[PDB]
Amino acid sequence: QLTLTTSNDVFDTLLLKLIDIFNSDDYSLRIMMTLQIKNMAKILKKTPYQLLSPILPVLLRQLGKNLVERKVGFQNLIELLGYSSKTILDIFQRYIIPYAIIQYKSDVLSEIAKIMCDGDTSLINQMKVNLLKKNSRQIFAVALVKHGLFSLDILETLFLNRAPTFDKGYITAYLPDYKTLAEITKLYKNSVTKDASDSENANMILCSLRFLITNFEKDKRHGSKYKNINNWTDDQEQAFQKKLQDNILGIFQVFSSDIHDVEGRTTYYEKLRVINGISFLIIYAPKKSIISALAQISICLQTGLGLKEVRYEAFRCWHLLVRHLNDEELSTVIDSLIAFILQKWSEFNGKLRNIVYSILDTLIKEKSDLILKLKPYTTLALVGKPELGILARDGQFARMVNKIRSTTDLIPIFANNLKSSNKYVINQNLDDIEVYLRRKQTERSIDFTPSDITLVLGALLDTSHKFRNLDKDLCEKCAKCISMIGVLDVTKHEFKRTTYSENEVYDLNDSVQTIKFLIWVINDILVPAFWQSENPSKQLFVALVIQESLKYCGLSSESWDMNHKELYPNEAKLWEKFNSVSKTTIYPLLSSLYLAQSWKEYVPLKYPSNNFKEGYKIWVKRFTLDLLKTGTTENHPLHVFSSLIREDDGSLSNFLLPYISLDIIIKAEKGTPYADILNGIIIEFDSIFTCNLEGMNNLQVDSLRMCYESIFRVFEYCKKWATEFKQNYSKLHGTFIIKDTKTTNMLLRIDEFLRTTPSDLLAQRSLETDSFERSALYLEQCYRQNPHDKNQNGQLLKNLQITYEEIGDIDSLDGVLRTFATGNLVSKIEELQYSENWKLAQDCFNVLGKFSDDPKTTTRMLKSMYDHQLYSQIISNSSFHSSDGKISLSPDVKEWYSIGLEAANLEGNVQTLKNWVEQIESLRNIDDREVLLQYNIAKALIAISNEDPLRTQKYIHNSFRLIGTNFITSSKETTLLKKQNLLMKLHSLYDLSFLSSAKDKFEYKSNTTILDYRMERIGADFVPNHYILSMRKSFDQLKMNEQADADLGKTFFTLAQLARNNARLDIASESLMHCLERRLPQAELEFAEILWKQGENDR
């Protein structure tokens, strides 16, 4: 229990001190130590193997010196671990076979053959020689540093007697292998106390680096002089620095391979000595070669920080890294660990907080150029968490803080940070936005310019849409930040809308546009994915693809960039089209040698075997991978990209699908399999559309929506590509666009590709998607291509009006209804509810709604009430109140309840809101995505009437979770007009949490003034104004404070003067009459304006 109070370094040291008295050859100590080790293991909820496996590379390492005598000690160790002696030995063969060889020649290697294979009849010679060949890299490493065997004949002779069947002297030319350099530099032990031995072995591995890389084929034999340090002349130091940079990316590839151990092969002792190797290469290397492969050690130290036991060594490795590097190059990687500092600060003990204080003071004294003005977010993030306490430390730094907050516009650097990938920085940006907007509310001067707030709103919508099935918590706080933004005015606030642009059209047949597509795809998505990767395998695959594309672009193999060549004007003007934030990360790996084919396990699968039941992201990756490896053949420049989509999150596969599918399109005269696999995907599209869509809950249908969208994209891309191909064919190649009857044969295959699985079914499988403009497009295309004079206009119209009545457009819907649809009189009735005589259609629907024949002619009445804000008439409907309660489980009745909850939220009345959710909670399994939002708002209002602040905070946070996962969708595709229906609900969710968090009237008056400030960004449309004021009304008459009632009279007067300006004085009167029971001295004029708008002038 002295060990139980410790952490990683001291914990492993004390476990070694436990086991070296475990084997202290006294029986009492041995039995007591077995008992205490096993109880210590079980009170840590660990088996004793995984308790002691992080020191088994150290414990039995010196047992390789003395295995023939201490057989009973190793026997005690194997009976304590609970495994067999062989199974712990082939998994720890890496650590003792490099010491079983290099000791005295009467070896324990015969006994390790005796254990590692059963019996003499199992032949020890071949198993001995292939275990020697198995971990020969570590043996070479131990030979070079731990004994200084700098002569190849020494290695060859001391091999060939230990194993006479060893191949070709040594396994030849494997010493300048990257793995040998890696195992050399993993043995850099280091500490805060620089010892003479710690300098000795450091100089020994430095001289072994000087032996292995700069003159190998000259000095395979004359190597005994390289053990001396100071006989190294400066004339051969630049040869060392030249051979080192050509021999450093692959050793980080080996480091990336054995940190992110995908098979569970080792413990974190490998990770510790990897981080030690990173620290050696930071210190004992040229400055350029760490600036070169910075994005290797970035996501090496990221996984070092991520794993628990190797945190402190990785922070010390960063502390080494942060001071050996300038400011303009550290900007690429600093956010990824400042976020880890801030978001994981709580569980840091004293030592980790000391080393992170030693990070930050070094960062703010010597390297303030990065923090203050190169990126000002990193100082406001550290000041923004006062738990850490930056300002009390320096004080002179606060002189920079209290002016750097003002002078730095902060929104567009929240923009490009929310499109990151690791969860820590997009928790830190959300926790900074929810403080930033809280300061900008009470500052009362957050900008709304007709650096836009709509940039960060679109970033938040994209963030919440990205994580709809991953980590509900950041979607919660993301939707909370959206609610803190609120509703924008739809006229003077607009998204990015980047489609009138280069428009992603790239012919992959000419080289001159292929190089432009490759430089664009490197610039926009490959360079960001090169940095923000999660596992280092994805970062290596991005490095491979971004190397091989440049090798296709004629920039990699020939070396020109040093400006001593200068005879490449074409290549320099081609290189200039990159930007510097991509140039500084693409410059090292021109001359890299990544080679990651991973061939011959591919099994090209037959296509109509669907993969929907696994998911969307499984399906699109497997389908894209089955495409681009069957239509490319290694010289078409999309070949290497297949390495990206075995670890993709679904984004990059969805990006590459139109390009590779369009390249499969342009193969002709069927003949080859290239068109035959085209016949694989058409029926695969037939697998997409003609599917079930029932029998699955609201997760697999969402994946089916994504599978829809992924292949609508290829249809519009094929259309866009064919149109621009016609355009640039008639543009440059002559003027008259008809020739040669073969480019026409190319253009026919998109036409039978854009008319296979054809319309009436694109429209049917698109209006359920909610991309309603696209559905309107397909409905009109299947209007015109149909001979419309016949009687197919019965089944075409009953969903055509659906694709206009929520698209925001009315004047075509009213134009569609009064043309070729004049049979039923009910169709002539429904034109009234959009043309100022809506209440003439309301009471027609109310008596059509008392026929009890169909359920949908009731929900038509309910939606026509809800679109015209007749909330008190919705909650008083007899379709719900049978006598007092409501009917059972809901096939279509839930669409009724979705209205009846929502109007009950907008009419603040605790009894009709309380028995309503009494009737809701008698149900069994509320499947409905829409009911539960208004339900949680209802129970929040009931708790807010019961004067219970934390309970209504809990239910409004439930509402934020439900909107941030389910209701919210992708930005940069939809408008703001369709998003506004959810933004009004978010703006009505924020103000309830903002008015509930108030214990007295002193801040309640300030809360009301802040909300009246929030009633100025809202715009001037009647629907969100009435909705937000209705929710403040519903707050102020559930909380029976007298100041709440004084607010309530104000809200009724503002509803009245709002509604009489919007020509809707039907509810302005019945809101103004509430101000007469309060008896305001201003209602006498407001009723005069209501009488004037009514029509009567003289009264």
């Binding site: 009492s28 039995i31 096993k38 991953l470 509900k472 959710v917 008698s922 439930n958 979770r961 439900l962």
Partner: protein, 422 residues
Amino acid sequence: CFLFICDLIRIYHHVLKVPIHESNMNLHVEPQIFQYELIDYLIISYSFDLLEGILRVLQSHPKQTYMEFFDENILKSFEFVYKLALTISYKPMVNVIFSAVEVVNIITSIILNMDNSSDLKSLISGSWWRDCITRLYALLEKEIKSGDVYNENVDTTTLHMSKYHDFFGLIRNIGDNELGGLISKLIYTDRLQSVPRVISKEDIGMFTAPIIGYKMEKWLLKLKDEVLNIFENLLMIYGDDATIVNGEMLIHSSKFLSREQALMIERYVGQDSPNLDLRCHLIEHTLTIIYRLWKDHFKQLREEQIKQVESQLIMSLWRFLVCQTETVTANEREMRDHRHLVDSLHDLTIKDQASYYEDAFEDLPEYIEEELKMQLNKRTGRIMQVKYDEKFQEMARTILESKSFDLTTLEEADSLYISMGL
């Protein structure tokens, strides 16, 4: 009635089969209803309690008539519902674990105390026992910690007695009956209805007393006493060797003995909880579950399985033989100063027993309280983990010292004896 309650529980298939951990995207946007969950928790708990009740009223019949109850169907149905109760991969409901081991106790108790013992044992297959005993082992290796009884924590290691099923039940009063006010608030009491009155789930839980945790420790310690009590019974059923009296009652019981001594000595002494004594009764009981296993059943204690616990058996026996030194107690004057440190709660218990609830504890005649300053002193010895009872010193001696098996060699044994003196 037993067959009906067994297939009634297999109707209610899904109460005892909620998963360990839910989805990360399991959004808790929901009506958060408790009334249907309260109904079928009451159904399952009252059903298993009725199984216990059927078997004790069958236990109370004259001992010639048990064959009128048992057949193949009884044992197959209870085998199913016993695999259902003592779960492995689902969230355990502790309310059914008590009754589901008490039923196994009633079975192994009547197998002992009947005359036609073979026709029960011929009716029982060995697969029933080797499915039962592994689940009893996995129950025995769980932990009892008062600070996170009622917390929701890692599965199958802490008997936790969840917040959402905390009521009495039929036989025994097992919790604090926090969900008994909600039984009466399940109906409208002035109305004739079918659907339940709505109970919100998150209102319960309000923090004043950890004493509730202490008495729930008391029930869980009696549960472990129950489990190794039925170990002690079915040693005596299968006195001859079989599939099931098979040496793992050295491994699991010696693991249990060694750890409930070790973290007794490290953590519990001087913690003034009422549950010390019973917790140092379990060790005092389970040594006997060692001892007659060692003495009367050595023929199945195989040579490999004894070496699976050679650490823990010898260490556990050594923590009894360390008490033959006894330079600690040796008098009367300072031992009561020890029980003011460790055992004030039992002083309160015996004063409230002496002044209220015991007929013989008044006008104490100077031989009944000399017995008290004998037995409180040997009790606080047995709590202080030094000076156990002499009979247990003998039983631990005649396993370590006796030559049925070389646990230690003679040059390894005196290495243990020098750490007491000797």
